[PDB]
Design a protein around this ligand. Sequence first.
Ligand SMILES: [Cl-]
Length: 390
Amino acid sequence: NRVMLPKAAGCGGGGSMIQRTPKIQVYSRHPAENGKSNFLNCYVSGFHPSDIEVDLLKNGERIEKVEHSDLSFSKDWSFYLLYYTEFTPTEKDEYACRVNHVTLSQPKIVKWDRDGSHSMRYFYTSVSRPGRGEPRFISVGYVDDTQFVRFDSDAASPREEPRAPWIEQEGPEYWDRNTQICKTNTQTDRESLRNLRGCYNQSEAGSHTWQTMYGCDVGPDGRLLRGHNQFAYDGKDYIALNEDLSSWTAADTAAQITQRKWEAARVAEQLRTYLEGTCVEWLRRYLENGKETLQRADPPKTHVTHHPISDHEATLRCWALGFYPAEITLTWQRDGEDQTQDTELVETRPAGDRTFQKWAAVVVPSGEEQRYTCHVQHEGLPKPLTLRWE
Ligand SMILES: [Cl-]
């Protein structure tokens, strides 16, 4: 259940804008077997700003009826989206993903090369679109790595919408209240965007991004472990509530003006009341109503593959599949010693069925594959797994 958020203050500097080009992964939900129905995924992550174009291709032809996830972002404020389609692969039918973004000068194509504690978070993204109407407002709510609501200001009838089966039982006063909070926050974000543009002497002709996150973490007993509330402008920290839930950290002079305004208005006190009360209380409720899924950890299915590169070298890839929640640690060791330097780690990616996937790769002198073991830490495993190349 949401909280009404404060407005950034109107007012030095000209600002600064972070741009991040998308990381792209194309993969199937399950290990692909010709003739068996499956899902083809294109996961784009780590990008900023949020406008992006993603197509799935089948033998170079764009696939129609591709669906995608609701816009959300990671702790560094960068965005991620999953695009996916049901399909049946063959041995020569070809699939790929084509991505365009402001950071690219031509569309980028990557082919399908088949070779305890809990948290609640709400994420908000507002993006102005000068000359093209009001800002786009999208907000999603998560319990751990399970999305349970979305609000999109561009929907035909913008409303808080259920996205997990255990939230559907909430009554109409719940949907009414949270829809109202979203609609109000839409307008608050519009004012924040206006005030921020003024603070940095920025033109009304340019697009800017205002992101908000808040939420709470609880232990196994249900007590509040900590609360969060952070804001970002154009992809960088702007102001954040400190862990004491009583003071702010402001990134620059303009944010200090917001800090002084929110101190005078006792915003931190209102957020503390929410985080210690409503937030933890509803999270505890959701965990009980969704216990069959939210409180079941799925351990990873793991295996190691061998990929020869040269005579004197080869790549070992350690795979983890079908795990929930997304938090996982994969580490390669040589004679038990972590190979921090030479390991390649991809971003953890959704399979599309609530579970997640990840791999870790290390380059090895051929003939010495046996001195290397992969080391998997996950909440669903009583203690770490170790695997060797067999
Ligand atoms: Cl993250």
